[PDB]
Enzyme design. Structure first.
Site, mmCIF file in Angstrom:
data_model
loop_
_atom_site.group_PDB
_atom_site.id
_atom_site.type_symbol
_atom_site.label_atom_id
_atom_site.label_comp_id
_atom_site.label_asym_id
_atom_site.label_seq_id
_atom_site.Cartn_x
_atom_site.Cartn_y
_atom_site.Cartn_z
ATOM 1 N N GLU A 127 46.307 38.138 47.000
ATOM 2 C CA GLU A 127 46.126 39.080 45.909
ATOM 3 C C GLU A 127 46.342 40.477 46.468
ATOM 4 O O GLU A 127 46.054 40.744 47.636
ATOM 5 C CB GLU A 127 44.722 38.987 45.285
ATOM 6 C CG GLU A 127 44.411 37.679 44.660
ATOM 7 C CD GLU A 127 43.007 37.603 44.037
ATOM 8 O OE1 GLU A 127 42.218 38.565 44.160
ATOM 9 O OE2 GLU A 127 42.723 36.569 43.412
ATOM 10 N N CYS B 295 47.048 35.674 41.539
ATOM 11 C CA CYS B 295 47.306 34.233 41.423
ATOM 12 C C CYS B 295 48.811 33.964 41.386
ATOM 13 O O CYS B 295 49.282 33.053 40.715
ATOM 14 C CB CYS B 295 46.594 33.710 40.178
ATOM 15 S SG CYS B 295 45.035 34.701 39.894
#
Length: 226
Positions: free
Chosen positions: A104, A1
């Site tokens: 990610e 994130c």
DNA sequence: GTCGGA
């Protein structure tokens, strides 16, 4: 994130949320063009004040004067609404960060392979954010955080956390100044987009270097060539 | 007063 793409025009994102009469955002046809948005940069952030939607360049990170570590960039949905640090931001500083998808890195031994994660149905994502109002002051320490949730279904193969992504309808409600922190907690629960709505693929290792901002960074690659 | 990697 901790990295995402925000590459398309403002209208490409805003059209899913509100018509012009609800906005206080000048028309601008230029694509934002950022395929590799990183913490510490200012990011176009959407919020509501004066009963209209505003788009302000806001520092991605949050470090009050009493904070001694590098700025935080995420706030966990499990606890942010009641956190001594984040409760005021949950109450008064809610915002939306729109994006095409996010990145990610999967641990594969001592190496790390980036993936790009996006909606299978081809809509942009509306990430729940909280931050320090007034956003328009351009603060360079107290900006916004992306709210996170636990990874579900197949995303756990990549990382145990993910951004809290809201439906367009829920994103619009999240921003309203009239709704309480308790109501915002209900929206964060009911409006969260589940993992089965996302697709993902490996991308080039070039996204690791923030100098790189081009469209190739979200293209699928073979891991064997990296 | 807490949560990415070139």
């Amino acid at each position: 994130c901790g990295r995402f793409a925000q590459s398309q025009t403002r209208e490409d994102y805003l059209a899913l949320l509100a018509e012009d009469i609800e906005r206080d955002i000048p028309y601008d046809p230029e694509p934002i063009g950022r395929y590799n948005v990183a913490p510490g940069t200012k990011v176009l952030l959407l919020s509501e004040r004066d009963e209209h939607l505003h788009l302000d360049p806001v520092f991605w990170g949050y470090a009050p004067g009493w904070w001694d570590k590098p700025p935080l960039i995420n706030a966990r949905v499990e606890t942010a609404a009641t956190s001594r640090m984040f409760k005021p931001l949950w109450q008064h500083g809610r915002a939306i960060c729109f994006a095409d998808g996010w990145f990610e890195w999967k641990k594969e031994g001592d190496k790390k392979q980036p993936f790009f994660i996006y909606r299978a149905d081809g809509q942009p994502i509306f990430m729940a954010a909280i931050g320090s109002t007034p956003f328009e002051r351009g603060d360079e320490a107290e900006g916004f955080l992306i709210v996170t949730a636990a990874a579900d279904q197949g995303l756990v193969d990549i990382h145990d956390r993910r951004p809290l992504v809201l439906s367009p309808e829920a994103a619009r409600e999240w921003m309203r100044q009239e709704i309480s922190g308790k109501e915002a907690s209900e929206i964060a629960a009911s409006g969260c987009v589940p993992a089965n709505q996302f697709s993902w693929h490996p991308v080039s290792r070039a996204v690791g270097n923030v100098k790189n901002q081009g469209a190739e960074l979200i293209q699928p690659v073979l891991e064997v060539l990296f």
